[PDB]
Amino acid sequence: MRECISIHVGQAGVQIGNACWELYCLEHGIQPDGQMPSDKTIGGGDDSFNTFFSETGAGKHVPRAVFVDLEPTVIDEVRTGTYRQLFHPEQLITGKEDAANNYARGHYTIGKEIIDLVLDRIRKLADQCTGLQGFLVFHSFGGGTGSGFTSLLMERLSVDYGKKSKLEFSIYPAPQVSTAVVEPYNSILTTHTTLEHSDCAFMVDNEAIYDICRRNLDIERPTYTNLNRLISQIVSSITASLRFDGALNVDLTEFQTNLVPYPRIHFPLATYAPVISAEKAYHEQLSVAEITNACFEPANQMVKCDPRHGKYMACCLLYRGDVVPKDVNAAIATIKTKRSIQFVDWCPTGFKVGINYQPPTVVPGGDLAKVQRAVCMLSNTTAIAEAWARLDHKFDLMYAKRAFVHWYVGEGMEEGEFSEAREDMAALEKDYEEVGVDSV
Amino acid sequence: MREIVHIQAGQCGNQIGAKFWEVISDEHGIDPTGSYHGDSDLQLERINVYYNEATGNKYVPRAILVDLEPGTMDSVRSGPFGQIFRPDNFVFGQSGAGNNWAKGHYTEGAELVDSVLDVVRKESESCDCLQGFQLTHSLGGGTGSGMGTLLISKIREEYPDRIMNTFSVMPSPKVSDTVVEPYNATLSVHQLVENTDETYCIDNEALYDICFRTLKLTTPTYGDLNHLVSATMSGVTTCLRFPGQLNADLRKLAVNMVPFPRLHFFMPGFAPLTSRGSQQYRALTVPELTQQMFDSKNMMAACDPRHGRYLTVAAIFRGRMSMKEVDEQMLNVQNKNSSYFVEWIPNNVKTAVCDIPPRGLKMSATFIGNSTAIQELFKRISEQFTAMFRRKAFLHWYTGEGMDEMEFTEAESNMNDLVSEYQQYQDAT
Amino acid sequence: KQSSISVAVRVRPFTEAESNRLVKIDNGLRKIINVVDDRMLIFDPPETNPLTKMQRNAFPNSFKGSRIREHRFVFDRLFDEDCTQDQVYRNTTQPLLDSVLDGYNATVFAYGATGCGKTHTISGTPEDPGVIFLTMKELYNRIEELKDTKIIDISLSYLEIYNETIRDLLNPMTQCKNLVIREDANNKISVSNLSRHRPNSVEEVMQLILEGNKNRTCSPTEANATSSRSHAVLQINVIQKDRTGDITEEHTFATLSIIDLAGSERAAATKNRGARLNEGANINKSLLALGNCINALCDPRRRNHVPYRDSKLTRLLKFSLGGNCKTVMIVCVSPSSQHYDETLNTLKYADRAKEIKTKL
Ligand SMILES: CC(=O)O[C@H]1C(=O)[C@@]2(C)[C@H]([C@H](OC(=O)c3ccccc3)[C@]3(O)C[C@H](OC(=O)[C@H](O)[C@@H](NC(=O)c4ccccc4)c4ccccc4)C(C)=C1C3(C)C)[C@]1(OC(C)=O)CO[C@@H]1C[C@@H]2O
Ligand SMILES: Nc1nc2c(ncn2[C@@H]2O[C@H](COP(=O)(O)OP(=O)(O)OP(=O)(O)O)[C@@H](O)[C@H]2O)c(=O)[nH]1
Ligand SMILES: Nc1ncnc2c1ncn2[C@@H]1O[C@H](COP(=O)(O)OP(=O)(O)NP(=O)(O)O)[C@@H](O)[C@H]1O
Ligand SMILES: Nc1nc2c(ncn2[C@@H]2O[C@H](COP(=O)(O)OP(=O)(O)O)[C@@H](O)[C@H]2O)c(=O)[nH]1
Ligand SMILES: [Mg+2]
């Protein structure tokens, strides 16, 4: 089988998960109460939903998810909402306060009081998986829970599993926009978990999605729901090859093999090209070439970084809908003719391509238009280092005076860690500068 | 689940607390008899934060009313919401403090502190998880400052790892209803700087200015000032009681706003304040609220932020609004007013958003600033304190109750050290 | 003008047990500490013999181990494994005996993690007495030498800081609320209700030290069965006046402070937790405050305001760290890899006093 286990940690993770599971239920015909009408109507027995759901004898489809948060508020919103009957009642909550935006509470003091329960539920889920493919972890770098507890959980999962893949879909701090004063500390301290215990980490910036919503969808006042829906579409694109048929199917192992050249360079950039409102869906052809060109536009990147200031190390184009391979080959040739899109000299091939026959499904009340074609581009490039460097500068401004450090050291974290993480981040930056240099 | 214990001390604290409980009961649908007659299921979802459930589907506030005379207790009991409080929580003596810090801290408050702490202990172990405490009082008086500081010390000893807030009414330079305010204020700030995680400084002068200018009231009374303070108090705790896009409990605000342990004196403010007959002339939107929060006239602490730099700010919004708008408005405030924000903190503004606005507004916002301008308040007290302490003006009333001049010198030194620490992070560096 | 604060780091020698436990791989343990000069230290050097195959990858051909863990620390004073306690005593605490005999204050800090060797240094064995014994012995010898033309008087106190509360060690009965710090107008700090003792020789001083150490607030089940959860401050007040000189109402005063610091703690080691989390939090906060104070004092710029009031320990030593007072800091570190992470933290704590950039 082709199972995947989703782990949503913190407020950002849980809300992205709400969007994700809404989308998956709509894609597979599952209703919020968990019942599939197509089973009783057509007859069933010829459907593939095991990647994200487990079927009981009575016909209820329980998602393979584990929602975790150190405060009850967001999960309590989940258990009173439309999807209260979907999830197993074991949605994990600490019966105490949150991490208060500091890594120490999520890692050392308050996070140790649910880690056993979380690992027990992950055990119970994985034992029901015959063909487990990997973990999909959702969190935020800038949060206390989404840094400390995700670090602790991924340490434990690496100790327990090791061989299984682990994919992060994290919300990285924006250059200018922010919603907390101690984001640089939490995000720097999260470098170890996302560099040593992950296998492919996808980073997303709220400012980039805000600009995408403004420019493309014509939404001057987007809230977090639109961001979560767009991220959900990206995750649906990544995991579509495990659920539907296609001319070229790309599972997680093939994708990682083609995209990760060395064990440490596993921080690609995602891009969903045909983000278009219904009004602009007309007046546009939305051909394969146009969407592939839109992928490489710097304005459409989901991280505030300029790909023109770096060299692409690898690319993976995952197409959905009415796409023929020859159109993709023509588009890739057009991209290779362009000079602004520079590839390293040691990856002459460059492009991994997958094609799927299932077009994207539109959520009612959503912003994206109904499109016959879609593509998700996952690009391993050296420009992403810029997004790190800015963050490091913020850290260097606060740690010089040891501001806000007493909160961290008063919850079981030694001071030297603040330096150590920074050093690790610097080392990572050096690697990203040492791979783009051309061969002698 | 995140229970707060509210303690009222002195006349000012008791009156602010009575108005605050009226406001919170209206917010949660609790009637004066203690029954729930709301219209939405969110009010009862987190009622345990401020209330305990009594048998007949009743809700008793988790409040403790303290004083050294029974007049204010009689006033609160006879008020509209006097019958909602637990009678055992009313703790009072018979001999007052007489506007003396020593009486309410050494002689007449020391006798009553055991009873008050017994009630506090009873109200603490009945909670599934205690978030922290919440004291309302004034520093310019006797029993307020004295018993509040004593209870702060003893609760901090008993519950060292729990949040302790304090909504303390500073004395003002212009408004002065008491002659010995500087001594009491200095002796109380000596205790608050060491045993509190958040101290929300409030001044009667700033509240009167808000009433005269923003609200255009002709004859403001203490009810209106208590109304403003209660609005801020309700706003601070909004994310512990209602859902939102960005949740921020008290500890998160403390972590974001307190760069160093002793810099925890905050200026509060409430955004949508407008005069009746001038509400149809404005569009209640996020930019208007943001412009009103950072205006010098909207602060409740009687300090000019233009005479200093913001170490940190926290904006707690309530209502349906887009996160993009809030993020750009905060970035615009910081970029346009870069001179009033420290350079060695890149983002100075913690942001929280709650999905349920107050009852009659489509949106609202609470401002909590940590700036160096608060320095000025302490400076003013010193300028009075020394002028009274160089000659030992009204000092025998304090030394007669076992105090020494060493305590006065220590308090003055600590307050000047706090002033120096705030002044350190003001100039460009 | 000059650096009154001086940092001394001491490297202990492998114990025969450890020297034969896992160093056999060399013929797993390795000397992560390398000593090059009296002011130079290399942490985690790339001195392993079978190592070329690793930088075959670290260079731009296989990015799996490109991280560089070699650190280069510089300190005012460094003691290798071969140096004995006499050199440490001469080069760290002996000059302070002059200043206290001259009139100025003096301070000694002792820091390290478990197994670092701090006890051997400060306390030592009866055959090999520690630094404290030598200091007090020479102090009393100097007093006997200056018995003519001057009279000296020695007062001893020994307190501990635990959970930001003071606790007399020589008079355990006194309650904490009674012990309060007081700043006189003479720029002197005195703790109320201190049990001051007048020992007559170094034997009595050591006897008082063991009597106090019997009472220290320790707890078991940590890497060491008798780990310390408090900062122990021993104060020796020297008050002297001319014997046959001018009989005037003026006698000169000085203090020698010796502070044994509790080691920093990472809750990750703790599992069951409880009040020990509170103890660790207080210890870590106090160490952070002390580091901030020392760094500000060394820095010419930030010392317009030094955060003395952030902890009781720094508040007590307000007039024992500045320009006039001479401060020394003995930081004992281990070379075994078994204590790798902890040692790094220790090496990072000492470095903060003066961030001497060794890239030059
Ligand atoms: C026509 C209209 O929109 O009515 C408003 C109103 O006119 C204005 C002027 C209200 C009004 O407030 C005042 O007149 C006032 C006077 C002195 C001091 C403080 C307020 C209002 O009374 C106040 C009242 O506010 C509330 O109901 C809030 O929930 C408030 N709670 C209470 O006022 C309250 C007090 C005692 C018992 C029950 C409720 C609150 C505020 C913050 C946090 C929690 C609750 C509102 C909507 C109005 C009136 C009625 C005219 C204002 O009040 C607030 C706190 O928002 C004053 O300026 C604002 C903006 C409003 O436009
Ligand atoms: N894209 C997106 N980002 C979100 C969402 N909710 C929160 N965030 C981001 O999360 C960052 C802060 O981290 P939080 O999610 O609040 O941390 P937390 O998970 O609540 O952990 P605690 O602090 O312990 O409560 C902010 O910068 C937000 O931009 C969301 O719904 N969508
Ligand atoms: N500097 C040193 N010179 C010689 N032997 C040493 C030295 N440091 C430690 N040892 C030896 O190694 C043993 C273990 O170190 P030890 O001095 O007992 O640690 P400790 O000081 O008790 N640890 P801690 O109090 O947490 O700093 C000692 O008992 C000595 O036998
Ligand atoms: N906001 C408000 N302030 C008050 C009130 N009553 C008194 N004050 C202020 O508090 C000061 C008197 O302190 P008070 O609380 O009466 O002293 P206490 O009785 O010993 O606690 C005066 O300077 C007033 O400015 C009130 O009802 N509301
Ligand atoms: Mg949260």
Author numbering:
A (entry chain A): 1 to 440
B (entry chain B): 1 to 429
C (entry chain K): 22 to 48, 101 to 433
Q: How do the authors describe this structure?
A:
Kinesin-8s are dual-activity motor proteins that can move processively on microtubules and depolymerize microtubule plus-ends, but their mechanism of combining these distinct activities remains unclear. The pathogenic yeast Candida albicans expresses a single kinesin-8 homolog, dubbed CaKip3, whose motor domain shares 60% sequence identity with that of S. cerevisiae Kip3. To understand the mechanistic basis for the dual-functionality of kinesin-8, we obtained seven cryo-EM structures of Candida albicans Kip3 bound to either the microtubule lattice or curved microtubule end mimics, and a microtubule-unbound CaKip3 X-ray structure. Our findings implicate loop-2 as a tubulin protofilament shape sensor that regulates conformational changes in the kinesin-8 motor domain, which can either induce curvature of protofilaments at the microtubule end, leading to microtubule depolymerization, or enable forward displacement of the neck linker for processive motility if the motor domain is bound to protofilaments in the microtubule lattice.
To investigate this hypothesis experimentally, we designed and expressed a mutant version of the CaKip3-MDN construct, whose long loop-2 was replaced with the short loop-2 sequence found in human kinesin-1, HsKIF5B (CaKip3-MDNL2-HsKHC), which does not contact α-tubulin in any of the available microtubule-bound or tubulin-bound kinesin-1 structures. In line with our hypothesis, the cryo-EM structure of this CaKip3 construct bound to microtubules has a docked neck-linker and closed nucleotide pocket in the ATP-like state (MT-CaKip3-MDNL2-HsKHC-ANP), unlike the CaKip3-MDN construct with a full loop-2 (MT-CaKip3-MDN-ANP). These data show that the kinesin-8-specific elongated loop-2 acts as a tubulin tether on the microtubule lattice pre-ATP hydrolysis, preventing the motor from closing, and that removing the CaKip3 loop-2 residues that interact with the microtubule lattice enable the motor domain to form the closed conformation in the ATP-bound state. To learn how the loop-2-tubulin interactions and motor domain conformations observed for microtubule-bound CaKip3 relate to its motile activity, we assessed the microtubule-gliding velocity of the CaKip3-MDN and CaKip3-MDNL2-HsKHC motors. The gliding data shows that elimination of the CaKip3 loop-2 increased the microtubule-gliding speed of the motor by over threefold. Our microtubule-binding data showed that CaKip3-MDN has ~35-fold higher affinity for microtubules than CaKip3-MDNL2-HsKHC when AMP-PNP occupies the nucleotide-binding pocket.
